[PDB]
Each structure stands twice: as C-alpha cells, then as structure tokens.
C-alpha cells in the first residue's frame, strides 16, 4: 500500500525535523542576551500627519529614497506622498476599490497594487504624457491578492488567497513561477535583502522560506497558534519575524530552523497586523488591533515603547531605508510619521 | 515666503489633488453600497439581472439613487480575512432559494441545502463587522417551492414543522426560521421579500429597504435617534 508507506515516512520525517531542531536548542535568544543593556524607553513623536484618504488605509510602502510613500485605501486610490513636505505627488484612481496591498518599486518607476479583484496592477509613474497609467495587469491568481513586492522593475512577487505565491514577469505579463505548499490563504510576503529568498505567511499558522529562482520551499516554520498576518526580515537576512492573530510576534532563525524568541504580553489580546524592524534590527515594531504600535526590544522581548495616536486599527507599518522614520497607517484614514 | 518657486508650485499641485479627492469623496458618499451574498446558486443570478475572476461589481440607478452592488461570491477563500472590508455598506442582500428545502449539498449528501443556507445567514447576520447593517433577504424560486411542498412537506428539513402543506404557511415558517437567527433584533432589521423568481418589484423592494436605512442613519447624524 503506497498510501500507507508514504504516510509512515511523512510522520517519521516530521519527527526527524523536530528532533533535529531540538538538538540545536542549547540556548535561547533570551538568555544569551541577558548581559545586554536594554534599549531603554523609546519615545517617538509624530512629526507628520498625512491627511487625504477618506477611507480605511490598508497598505503602505516606503520608496527607497526614504522620502516618498505610497499608500492605498478603500477610496480606490493610491497616493504618492512627499513625507518631508506633506505633499501629494500623485493620486492614482483604481479600477477596483478593494485594494489590500501596494508596493513601490525600488527604482521609483512603478507602483503595484490590488486586492479582491485577484489582479496585481502595475502603474507607471514616469510617463511622457505626465500622468500615471496602468502599464500591466497581472491576472492568474484565483484568490484575493494579499501582498505585492517588487524584486526589480520587471519582476513582482505576489501572494494570494488561493494559497499560492507567484513570481511574475511584468513585461510578458506571465507568471513564471508558482510557489505552492501552503494550505491556507497567504497573508504576507517579505523579501530577503538580496532578493533571492522570500518568506510567506499564511492562515496555516506557518511560514515558509522560498527559493525564488528554484520555485521551491526550503524551510517550514511553525509556532503560531493562529493565522500569520505579517512578516518581515531581520535586516541581515538570517531571520524573520512574524505577527499573528494569537497576539504574539515570533522571531525565527533560518539557519537554526527554529523559533528563537516570542514577543508577547499579558495585556495584549489583539492581533498583529503589521511588523517591521529598525536598521540595526534592535527594535521590532508591531501594529495591533488595539490601535497602538508597540516597539519591542528585539533582543529581549521587552516593550521599549508605544506609538499611540491612531483612533482605529493600525493596518500597516513601514520604516524608511535609512532608518530615519516610522510611518504608521490605520483605519482612521490617516498616516503618521514618527521619529 | 521661504519656499522656492518650484516648491510653491509643488504645493499648488498638492492642493489641486486635495480638491479632486474631496469631490470624489462626496460622490462616493452619495452612492449606496450593497453587499450581495447568498447560499450558492440561490437565485442570486436572477436578482442581478433585474438590478443590473474576483469581486464583481454592478451599477444600478433607480429613483435617483445610485447603487453599487458587490457580488463577493466565487471567492473560495476565508471570509474572516476580507469580509471586514465591507463593514461600511448600507445593506446586505442575502439570497436564499426556498425550493432548496428538499435538497442536499452535492459535497455532503446528509447536509440539507436549506440548513447550509441558514448557517451562512447566521455567520453574516451575527458577524461582528455587521452589527448595524441591515439585511434584505430574498426568498427565491418560490413558484418551484409552492409546487414541491404539495409532494414533499417541509418536515423533510424541518421535522418540527406542524403546519399544513400550504405555501403561505410553509413560506412563513421558513421566513421565521431565518429571522430568528437575528441575535441583534433591536439593532438591525431584516427585510424579507418573496421574489418568487418572477416578480419585477425586486428593485423596489431594495429601494425601500434602503431609504429606511438612510433615514435611520440621518436620524443618528441629526442627533435625534
């Protein structure tokens, strides 16, 4: 019986992986870090409030110049903002208002977005005509688009509610790689600093490390009790953090193939909607359903501070590439920039 | 003062963008958003003909209201990860097809289609994101109902039913079974209409449920409710 032989190997293999990981558990982060001075209290202030959206903000993405942002809301609009001056640079009407994700290309030439239309639309921000236009619509997913990230101007990585992730060739409009293996809706993507790997999170309460060029899952990380809503990479690319509906964040090390640290508190029963790291990786920031963003000391799991100031669910966080500022967006229709 | 000629121009452009965002805001505010749900192939596709891969939008105008209907079916994904984006709607239109009482789900021979319909109704009706959003419930394929019940009494799916095999009573029983799933009767209303898959007043039914919702909303904004 082929079915039983394969099921028996799968259980044995699950046990080998579990033990291979226990074999590496000679420390936790939380103990090697006992002799590290705490970051102390981190008190950030709102420096800018970006007003203009008339609806819940679902997505944010900082451009690479640390000055421009793209934000998306249920207004059916993307807004390109000048974070220093509080100016609208562009406002882009969408064909579908049901937008859940957006992304700024590293070059600043393109903006991606989409959501319940199951399409990732790519907008060209730099045209001869002087207007932002759709250059390409990428269709193929059968579920909602939960997250977009650009690798370069011709490549966009998407994740969706159809349980898969995909790598698209923007110029041909074709999907070149399909990344399968999740069983639940995929909620988020995070690209490695070198673009070669990406980590996806899903409603499987698991996250997977994918090999972008191979179209292969390399590592599966578990530990959450519930759906993972947000993922980001630790700046050097060897770890990632994830946030879920079980109201915790978890740090995972890719070489250890283990959960390294849990960030939680007895008074938080809210899900995590967004996670990000500061440049040194010392601070972990997370947006919560309680309308606050917590700042965690990533090497201790202490709460370093709180960014309070939204009147509704924090839907998204972003940190600039130069580390100068943190932007938070929320369901109260505002974006705020903190320093 | 302070700003360069180009920075001043950039500010002027930003201000024009704000004016345009506000005008679109006002237009959107006037439109009526309707979420269209239903128990699979429950006559949903007939209602949209009269009220004419991902989410499908339908635009419709009647008595100067501009309606926008969102058909969110055919999204075989978890509602808990997207249904909240529809929190801000005027009403939910929910389609149930009464002839379903003697049917079972293709995927589960022991699961009555009508109970599957009630389970969905309850998941939406008592959802935390829709606690003040009214429901317009349409009972479809009534002509088919009315004839089947003369051969197959309701008990088939409602063993406790003790009325006659009369569609007026059987239909009332089904209506009650759905209205009693409302655990927030003092907050959200359920408007029930029998469309029979033949009526032409289905548009009017939505219109009137909608104007009643709008007046309650104005009474709340006026500080009267």
């Amino acid at each position, epitope marked *: 019986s082929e079915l039983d032989q394969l099921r028996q190997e799968a259980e044995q293999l699950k046990n080998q992986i579990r033990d291979a990981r226990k074999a590496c558990a000679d420390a936790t982060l939380s103990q090697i870090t006992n002799n590290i001075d705490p970051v102390g209290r981190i008190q950030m202030r709102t420096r800018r409030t970006l007003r203009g959206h008339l609806a819940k903000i679902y997505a944010m993405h900082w451009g690479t110049d640390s*000055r*421009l942002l793209v934000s998306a809301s249920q207004d059916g609009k993307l807004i390109i903002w*000048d974070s220093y*001056t509080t*100016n609208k*640079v*562009h406002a882009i009407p969408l064909r579908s208002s049901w937008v859940m994700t957006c992304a700024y290309a590293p070059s*600043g030439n393109y903006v991606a977005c989409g959501g319940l239309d199951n399409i990732c639309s790519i907008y060209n921000l730099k045209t*001869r*005509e*002087g*207007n932002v236009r759709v250059s390409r619509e990428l269709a193929g997913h059968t579920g909602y688009l939960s997250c977009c990230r650009f690798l370069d101007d011709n490549q966009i990585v998407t994740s969706s509610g159809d349980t898969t992730c995909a790598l698209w060739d923007i110029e041909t409009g074709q999907q070149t790689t399909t990344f399968t293996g999740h069983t639940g809706d995929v909620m988020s993507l995070s690209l490695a600093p070198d673009t070669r790997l990406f980590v996806s999170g899903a409603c499987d309460a698991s996250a997977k490390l994918w090999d972008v060029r191979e179209g292969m899952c390399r590592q599966t990380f578990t530990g959450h009790e519930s759906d993972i809503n947000a993922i980001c990479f630790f700046p050097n690319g060897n770890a990632f953090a994830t946030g879920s509906d079980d109201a915790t964040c978890r740090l995972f090390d890719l070489r250890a193939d283990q959960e390294l640290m849990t960030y939680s508190h007895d008074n938080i029963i809210c899900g995590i909607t967004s996670v990000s790291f500061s440049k040194s990786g010392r601070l972990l920031l997370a947006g919560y359903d309680d309308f606050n963003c917590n700042v965690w000391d990533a090497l201790k799991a202490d709460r370093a501070g709180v960014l309070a100031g939204h009147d509704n669910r924090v839907s998204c966080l972003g940190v600039t590439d130069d580390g100068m500022a943190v932007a938070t967006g929320s369901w109260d229709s505002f974006l705020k920039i903190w320093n | 003062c*302070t700003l*360069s*000629a*180009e*920075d001043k*121009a*950039a500010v*002027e*452009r930003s*201000k*024009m963008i704000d004016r345009n965002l506000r005008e679109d805001g006002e237009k959107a505010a006037r439109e009526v958003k309707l979420l269209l749900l239903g128990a699979g192939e429950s006559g949903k596709n007939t209602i949209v003909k009269q009220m004419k891969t991902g989410i499908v939008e339908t635009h419709f105008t009647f008595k100067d209201l501009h309606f926008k209907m969102f058909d969110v079916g055919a999204q075989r994904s978890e509602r808990k990860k997207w249904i909240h984006c529809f929190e801000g709607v005027t009403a939910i239109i929910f389609c149930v097809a009464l002839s379903d009482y003697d049917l079972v789900l293709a995927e589960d021979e022991e699961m009555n289609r009508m109970h599957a319909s009630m389970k969905l109704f309850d998941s939406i009706c008592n959802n935390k994101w829709f606690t003040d959003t009214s429901i317009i419930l349409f009972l479809n394929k009534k002509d088919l109902f009315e004839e089947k019940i003369k051969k197959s009494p309701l008990t088939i799916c409602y063993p406790e039913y003790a009325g006659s095999n009369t569609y007026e009573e059987a239909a009332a029983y089904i209506q009650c079974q759905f209205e009693d799933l409302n655990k927030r009767k003092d907050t959200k209303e359920i408007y029930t209409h029998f469309t029979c898959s033949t009526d032409t007043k289905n548009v009017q039914f939505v219109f009137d449920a909608v104007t009643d919702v709008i007046i309650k909303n104005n009474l709340k904004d006026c500080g009267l409710f």
Partner: single-chain antibody
Amino acid sequence: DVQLVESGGGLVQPGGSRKLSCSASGFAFSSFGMHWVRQAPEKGLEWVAYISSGSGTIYYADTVKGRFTISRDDPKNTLFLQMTSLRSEDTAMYYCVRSIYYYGSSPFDFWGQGTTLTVSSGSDIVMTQATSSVPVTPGESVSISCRSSKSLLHSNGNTYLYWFLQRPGQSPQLLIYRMSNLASGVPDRFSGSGSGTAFTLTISRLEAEDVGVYYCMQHLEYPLTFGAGTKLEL
C-alpha cells in the same frame, strides 16, 4: 508623441495686437504649467509668462506685464497670449514650454517649435555665460561655464540651475535640471556640476549632434532668467 504647436504669428504694425495660440496634444495638458519663452533675433532667450496648472497663478516678465495676458483653455488643450500694444522690441520667436512641478519632476522638458512674431518699426538674478563661442574638435571634451549673481542653492538642498541646448533650426532641448540631473533622452555624454554661484556643463567626447547654443537658466525665483548662451562650434 508629445506635441506643442504654436500658431498665430505673422506681421503686425506697432501699437497693434495679436493673439498667439498653442495647441497641445499627446499629453495630459491640464496637469502641466505652461510658459512662454521668447527668442530674440539676437538669439537670447527670455522668459515671458507663466500660467500654472489649474490657472492658480500667473507671472509675467516685467517688460510684458500689463501688456500681454497669458491664458489657458484646458478643454481644448490650448494656450494663448493676448499681446496688446506691440512694439518692435517684441519681435521674437515665441515658444510654448511644458512644465510640471512635483517632487522629482523635470520642468521645461518639452518645447514647441515656435511661431514668429514680427513687429514693424531690478533684483533679478543675472546669469552670465561669459564665453560667447567655443570651437571644439569633435571627439574631444567641452567645458561650458555659467555664473550667477545670486546663489542658486536653496535651503531645501536644491540648486535651481537648468541647462538647455538649441541646435540650429530647432527649439531648445532640456539637458540638465537642478544642476546635475539629466533629462530623459539625454545621453551620458552630458554631465552637470558646480555649486553656489559657479556652474559647469561638461560634455565628454563631443559628437557633431551636440553642436549648438548652450543656455543657462535659473529657476529660483521669478522672473526666470537665462544667460547669454555659448555657441559650441565645429
């Protein structure tokens, strides 16, 4: 492609008036500010007037202010200059210039072809381009300098210097904006550098197609001003 066509030029007697028109096509006209720029028979360029997008603001050069009126009609994609009490000093080629302002934009990146108006019988920043002409053997580099009477460096970090090239028989082309940014379509043979009040346009490996007059413009304050222009020769 992007197009601006000037028309309505011709011969007028002094004291009379004309209306110049400029038809735009190929672009989102209503989103662009527009300028009129004159080129005298002496070939210096002079800014005449600016109409912002949305017609929020209008600026005029002091010599035309009160005489010329600049207007826009977005639904037909056109600009106009209503020119009253024309004097012979007003003889020039009149060009429409497209300009859009936002962070990271490239203003003055498209010029029309101009129409010709022939009329019978301050605290301004002065840009000076000492050299009038420079012969350069093709294949060798070029250095074109420009000085300003005022620093063009604003406290926001931007230096508002623009360089334009006018090839014989052609309207001016933007080469460099804000000191060092190349305009789209401009080869990497061109490079800008400098600071304060001293600026340089560097050309590496000159091509025959690069021969024409190089104009220096400041955009720190209105009136916008141009330098004399250095003619590259050979």
